[PDB]
What does this fold into?
Amino acid sequence: VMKIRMVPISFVFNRFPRMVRDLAKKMNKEVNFIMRGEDTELDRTFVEEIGEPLLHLLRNAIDHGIEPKEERIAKGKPPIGTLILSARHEGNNVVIEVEDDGRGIDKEKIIRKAIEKGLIDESKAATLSDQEILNFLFVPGFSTKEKVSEVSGRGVGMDVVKNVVESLNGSISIESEKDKGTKVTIRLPL
Ligand SMILES: Nc1ncnc2c1ncn2[C@@H]1O[C@H](COP(=O)(O)OP(=O)(O)OP(=O)(O)O)[C@H]2OC3(O[C@H]21)C([N+](=O)[O-])=CC(=[N+]([O-])O)C=C3[N+](=O)[O-]
It folds into this structure.
C-alpha cells in the first residue's frame, strides 16, 4: 500500500525466550536471556522474515558463544552466560542486536583460514579493519569445515542472514573480542 503497518517488535521477540530455554537445556548451558526495547516498532514485512535471522544469531551465541562453568570462572566470570537481544530507535532506523558475553570469534584465526584458501594475501591483511576481517563469515562457503559428506542436507550460511538482511536493504556488523563475547548488530530502515 501507500501506508505500511508498523507493529511492535515485541511480537517477534516474545517467542525467543522459550527457544532459548530449549537450546539452553538441549546444550545443557544455563543462559540468562535478556530482551530490551521490546516496544520498538518495525514494518510488518520485516517482522516476518526477521525471526530466523535473530534466531540463528541467538543460536550461535547460545551454542558457540556461552561457555560451560569452570571455563568461565577459569576465564574469570559468572557461571551463567548472558544473551542480550535488543532493538531501539536510531534515526529512522531500527537497530537490533544480539550481544553475548561469549568466547567470541578470533579475527587472526580467520585470516589463518581465509588465507589458507586465498581470498586475501599476507600483505592485504594489514588493511582489514576489525570489521572487514569479520565480514568474512558473510562469504558463501567461508567455513570450509562442512563439505564432503557430513554436509547435512540443510544449514544456513551466515550469509542467509546477510541475505535475509539484504533482501531487506539491511546492514549487519560484527564486534568480537576473544573470550569477552560477541556483539552482532543489524541496522534496518524505517
Ligand atoms: N557467537 C559466537 N561465539 C563463538 N563462535 C561463533 C559465534 N558465532 C559464530 N561462531 C563461529 O562458530 C564456530 C563454532 O566454534 P566452536 O563451538 O569452538 O566449534 P564447532 O566446531 O563446535 O562449530 P561448527 O559446528 O564448525 O560451526 C567457530 O568457528 C569460527 O568462529 C566460530 C572460528 N573460531 O571460533 O575461532 C574460527 C574460524 N576461522 O575461520 O578461523 C571460523 C569460524 N566459523 O567459521 O564459524
The helical segments are 10-13, 16-26, 44-49, 51-65, 69-73, 107-115, 130-135, 160-166. Residues 60-61, 64-65, 100, 102-106, 109-110, 112-113, 137, 143, 145, 182 surround 128 (CB under 6 Å). The chain is about 35% helix and 25% strand. The chain has one domain: 1-190.
